[PDB]
Design an enzyme around this catalytic site. Structure first.
Site, PDB file in Angstrom:
ATOM      1  N   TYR A   1       0.796  -1.260   0.000  1.00 12.44           N
ATOM      2  CA  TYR A   1       0.000   0.000   0.000  1.00 12.44           C
ATOM      3  C   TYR A   1       0.829   1.312   0.000  1.00 12.44           C
ATOM      4  O   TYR A   1       0.465   2.246  -0.701  1.00 12.44           O
ATOM      5  CB  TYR A   1      -1.167  -0.033   1.019  1.00 12.44           C
ATOM      6  CG  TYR A   1      -2.277  -0.884   0.490  1.00 12.44           C
ATOM      7  CD1 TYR A   1      -2.444  -2.204   0.938  1.00 12.44           C
ATOM      8  CD2 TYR A   1      -3.141  -0.397  -0.511  1.00 12.44           C
ATOM      9  CE1 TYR A   1      -3.419  -3.017   0.430  1.00 12.44           C
ATOM     10  CE2 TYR A   1      -4.136  -1.215  -1.068  1.00 12.44           C
ATOM     11  CZ  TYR A   1      -4.270  -2.516  -0.585  1.00 12.44           C
ATOM     12  OH  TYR A   1      -5.257  -3.322  -1.056  1.00 12.44           O
TER      13      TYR A   1
ATOM     14  N   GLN B   1     -14.989   3.221  -8.886  1.00 15.40           N
ATOM     15  CA  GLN B   1     -14.546   1.976  -8.337  1.00 15.40           C
ATOM     16  C   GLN B   1     -13.064   2.057  -8.014  1.00 15.40           C
ATOM     17  O   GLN B   1     -12.549   1.212  -7.322  1.00 15.40           O
ATOM     18  CB  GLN B   1     -14.782   0.887  -9.388  1.00 15.40           C
ATOM     19  CG  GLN B   1     -16.248   0.464  -9.494  1.00 15.40           C
ATOM     20  CD  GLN B   1     -16.531  -0.336 -10.765  1.00 15.40           C
ATOM     21  OE1 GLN B   1     -16.742   0.229 -11.880  1.00 15.40           O
ATOM     22  NE2 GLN B   1     -16.600  -1.648 -10.598  1.00 15.40           N
TER      23      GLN B   1
ATOM     24  N   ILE C   1      -9.392   3.462  -6.504  1.00 11.46           N
ATOM     25  CA  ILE C   1      -8.941   3.963  -5.214  1.00 11.46           C
ATOM     26  C   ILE C   1      -7.730   4.929  -5.362  1.00 11.46           C
ATOM     27  O   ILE C   1      -7.095   5.306  -4.374  1.00 11.46           O
ATOM     28  CB  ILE C   1      -8.557   2.798  -4.313  1.00 11.46           C
ATOM     29  CG1 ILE C   1      -7.399   1.981  -4.916  1.00 11.46           C
ATOM     30  CG2 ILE C   1      -9.793   1.906  -4.018  1.00 11.46           C
ATOM     31  CD1 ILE C   1      -6.892   0.979  -3.931  1.00 11.46           C
TER      32      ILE C   1
ATOM     33  N   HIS D   1     -15.073   1.897  -3.294  1.00 10.15           N
ATOM     34  CA  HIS D   1     -14.084   0.922  -2.805  1.00 10.15           C
ATOM     35  C   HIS D   1     -13.046   1.497  -1.859  1.00 10.15           C
ATOM     36  O   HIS D   1     -12.033   0.835  -1.608  1.00 10.15           O
ATOM     37  CB  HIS D   1     -13.340   0.203  -3.972  1.00 10.15           C
ATOM     38  CG  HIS D   1     -14.217  -0.664  -4.819  1.00 10.15           C
ATOM     39  ND1 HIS D   1     -14.050  -0.786  -6.182  1.00 10.15           N
ATOM     40  CD2 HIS D   1     -15.279  -1.434  -4.504  1.00 10.15           C
ATOM     41  CE1 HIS D   1     -14.960  -1.611  -6.666  1.00 10.15           C
ATOM     42  NE2 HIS D   1     -15.719  -2.017  -5.667  1.00 10.15           N
TER      43      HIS D   1
ATOM     44  N   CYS E   1      -8.660   2.822  11.578  1.00  7.04           N
ATOM     45  CA  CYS E   1      -8.135   2.163  12.736  1.00  7.04           C
ATOM     46  C   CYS E   1      -8.762   0.797  12.992  1.00  7.04           C
ATOM     47  O   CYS E   1     -10.003   0.664  13.125  1.00  7.04           O
ATOM     48  CB  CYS E   1      -8.304   3.051  13.958  1.00  7.04           C
ATOM     49  SG  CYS E   1      -7.555   2.319  15.407  1.00  7.04           S
TER      50      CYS E   1
ATOM     51  N   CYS F   1     -10.454   1.225  16.926  1.00  6.37           N
ATOM     52  CA  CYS F   1     -11.576   2.126  17.200  1.00  6.37           C
ATOM     53  C   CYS F   1     -12.453   2.418  15.994  1.00  6.37           C
ATOM     54  O   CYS F   1     -13.498   3.035  16.146  1.00  6.37           O
ATOM     55  CB  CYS F   1     -11.080   3.436  17.811  1.00  6.37           C
ATOM     56  SG  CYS F   1     -10.328   4.624  16.702  1.00  6.37           S
TER      57      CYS F   1
ATOM     58  N   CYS G   1      -5.907   5.645  21.986  1.00  3.98           N
ATOM     59  CA  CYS G   1      -6.177   4.458  21.176  1.00  3.98           C
ATOM     60  C   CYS G   1      -4.936   3.621  20.868  1.00  3.98           C
ATOM     61  O   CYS G   1      -4.875   2.448  21.243  1.00  3.98           O
ATOM     62  CB  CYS G   1      -6.886   4.779  19.846  1.00  3.98           C
ATOM     63  SG  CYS G   1      -7.221   3.226  18.959  1.00  3.98           S
TER      64      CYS G   1
ATOM     65  N   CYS H   1     -10.985   6.721 -23.590  1.00  2.01           N
ATOM     66  CA  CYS H   1     -11.833   7.792 -23.036  1.00  2.01           C
ATOM     67  C   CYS H   1     -11.153   9.165 -22.984  1.00  2.01           C
ATOM     68  O   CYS H   1     -11.821  10.181 -22.889  1.00  2.01           O
ATOM     69  CB  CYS H   1     -12.461   7.360 -21.690  1.00  2.01           C
ATOM     70  SG  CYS H   1     -11.341   7.235 -20.307  1.00  2.01           S
TER      71      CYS H   1
HETATM   72  N1  APR Z   1      -8.206   4.149 -22.298  1.00  2.80           N
HETATM   73  C1  APR Z   1      -9.346   3.515 -21.975  1.00  2.80           C
HETATM   74  N2  APR Z   1     -10.530   4.172 -22.092  1.00  2.80           N
HETATM   75  C2  APR Z   1     -11.704   3.589 -21.783  1.00  2.80           C
HETATM   76  N3  APR Z   1     -11.792   2.318 -21.339  1.00  2.80           N
HETATM   77  C3  APR Z   1     -10.665   1.543 -21.199  1.00  2.80           C
HETATM   78  C4  APR Z   1      -9.352   2.118 -21.486  1.00  2.80           C
HETATM   79  N4  APR Z   1      -8.428   1.157 -21.233  1.00  2.80           N
HETATM   80  C5  APR Z   1      -9.092   0.048 -20.801  1.00  2.80           C
HETATM   81  N5  APR Z   1     -10.429   0.291 -20.765  1.00  2.80           N
HETATM   82  C6  APR Z   1     -11.493  -0.610 -20.336  1.00  2.80           C
HETATM   83  O1  APR Z   1     -11.613  -0.511 -18.918  1.00  2.80           O
HETATM   84  C7  APR Z   1     -12.152  -1.735 -18.447  1.00  2.80           C
HETATM   85  C8  APR Z   1     -11.231  -2.167 -17.335  1.00  2.80           C
HETATM   86  O2  APR Z   1     -11.914  -3.214 -16.664  1.00  2.80           O
HETATM   87  P1  APR Z   1     -11.360  -3.817 -15.292  1.00  2.80           P
HETATM   88  O3  APR Z   1      -9.855  -3.859 -15.329  1.00  2.80           O
HETATM   89  O4  APR Z   1     -12.279  -5.019 -15.052  1.00  2.80           O
HETATM   90  O5  APR Z   1     -11.647  -2.601 -14.243  1.00  2.80           O
HETATM   91  P2  APR Z   1     -12.975  -2.195 -13.419  1.00  2.80           P
HETATM   92  O6  APR Z   1     -14.228  -2.448 -14.206  1.00  2.80           O
HETATM   93  O7  APR Z   1     -12.796  -0.891 -12.678  1.00  2.80           O
HETATM   94  O8  APR Z   1     -12.932  -3.382 -12.328  1.00  2.80           O
HETATM   95  C9  APR Z   1     -13.918  -3.459 -11.313  1.00  2.80           C
HETATM   96  C10 APR Z   1     -13.253  -3.863  -9.994  1.00  2.80           C
HETATM   97  O9  APR Z   1     -12.608  -5.123 -10.129  1.00  2.80           O
HETATM   98  C11 APR Z   1     -11.522  -5.220  -9.224  1.00  2.80           C
HETATM   99  O10 APR Z   1     -10.436  -5.839  -9.954  1.00  2.80           O
HETATM  100  C12 APR Z   1     -11.166  -3.787  -8.837  1.00  2.80           C
HETATM  101  O11 APR Z   1     -11.458  -3.579  -7.457  1.00  2.80           O
HETATM  102  C13 APR Z   1     -12.127  -2.919  -9.599  1.00  2.80           C
HETATM  103  O12 APR Z   1     -12.592  -1.841  -8.783  1.00  2.80           O
HETATM  104  C14 APR Z   1     -12.178  -2.733 -19.618  1.00  2.80           C
HETATM  105  O13 APR Z   1     -13.555  -2.819 -20.027  1.00  2.80           O
HETATM  106  C15 APR Z   1     -11.294  -2.092 -20.675  1.00  2.80           C
HETATM  107  O14 APR Z   1     -11.785  -2.206 -22.002  1.00  2.80           O
HETATM  108 ZN    ZN Z   2      -8.052   4.096  16.869  1.00  7.55          ZN
END
Ligand code: APR
Ligand code: ZN
Length: 260
Positions: free
Chosen positions: A60, A98, A100, A116, A124, A127, A170, A251
């Protein structure tokens, strides 16, 4: 699903309340594998943290530090500029992410639901208090730690030198405030989410695979009310045919146009 930009823009010009659901694809153009011998599924669990809190913290710390280096791309900036612009007109724009990584925030997004958690929040384990944390390094024992390269091994930081709670009296062990595999999402955040989906009149689904619950079901919930949903993705997904629009491409190219 249509690919008519012009027909999208007609809806966009009039939308009072836009919800933008984002996933990992939105950060791809910001340059956001394995860490040492593990992947996320082996580290981002309560069992992993219970067994090796130092190793989960190194992981992390490394992710937090890498982020400081990453810049929001034209996609994140188009989404933030949109919110600022509509907000001068009394029109609402909210991001439900979704991710972080907090690149939406770095772009200037203010209305953000992080379902997420965040690399830049702690909780913590004693607490339960959550706080924001932007300090590099989070604690001096983690300074220079977390390197993923071959030849690096466990720092083995004693637990009392890992991040600790500053609440008076704590002293507890902190964890990242992120939702780990196996853990439930926060019911309070999901109500804020439900409220935004129920009230929106235009929804964008951006860089998400649409197969991971419960976010997979947000945009289909909106489209079911007869609201237009526009997917922005490099590929079709299994949910694509449920939506009013599909705009294929990175995008960072398609959003600055759609949200201009
Ligand atoms: N430049 C881009 N522009 C738009 N879309 C894109 C690009 N590059 C990749 N993608 C798309 O983004 C998507 C990525 O999918 P995942 O990696 O499955 O990510 P996400 O949907 O956020 O995953 C959901 C959750 O799964 C866990 O692994 C993690 O906690 C995450 O929050 C795919 O559909 C892929 O085509
Ligand atoms: Zn604490």
């Amino acid at each position: 699903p249509s690919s008519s930009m012009a027909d999208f823009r007609k809806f966009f010009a009039k939308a009072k309340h836009i919800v933008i659901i984002s996933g990992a694809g939105v950060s791809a153009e910001s340059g956001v594998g394995y860490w040492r011998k593990w992947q996320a599924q082996d580290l981002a669990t309560p069992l992993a943290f219970a067994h090796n809190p130092s190793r989960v913290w190194e992981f992390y710390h490394y992710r937090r530090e890498v982020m400081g280096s990453k810049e929001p791309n034209a996609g994140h900036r188009a989404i933030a500029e949109c919110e600022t612009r509509l907000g001068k007109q009394g029109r609402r724009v909210v991001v439900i992410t979704q991710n972080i990584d907090e690149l939406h925030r770095k772009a200037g997004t203010k209305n953000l639901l992080e379902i997420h958690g965040s690399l830049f929040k702690t909780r913590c384990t004693s607490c339960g208090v959550v706080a924001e944390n932007y300090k590099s390094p989070i604690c001096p024992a983690l300074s220079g730690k977390g390197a993923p390269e071959p030849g690096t091994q466990d720092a083995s930081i004693p637990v009392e030198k890992l991040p600790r709670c500053e609440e008076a009296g704590c002293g507890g062990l902190l964890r990242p405030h992120v939702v780990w595999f196996g853990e439930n999402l926060d019911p309070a955040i999901l109500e804020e989410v439900d409220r935004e989906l129920a009230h929106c009149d235009l929804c964008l689904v951006v860089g998400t695979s649409s197969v991971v619950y419960p976010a997979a079901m947000f945009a289909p919930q909106v489209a079911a009310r007869g609201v237009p949903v526009a997917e922005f993705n490099t590929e079709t997904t299994p949910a694509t045919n449920r939506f009013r629009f599909h705009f294929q491409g990175p995008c960072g190219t398609t959003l600055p146009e759609a949200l201009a």
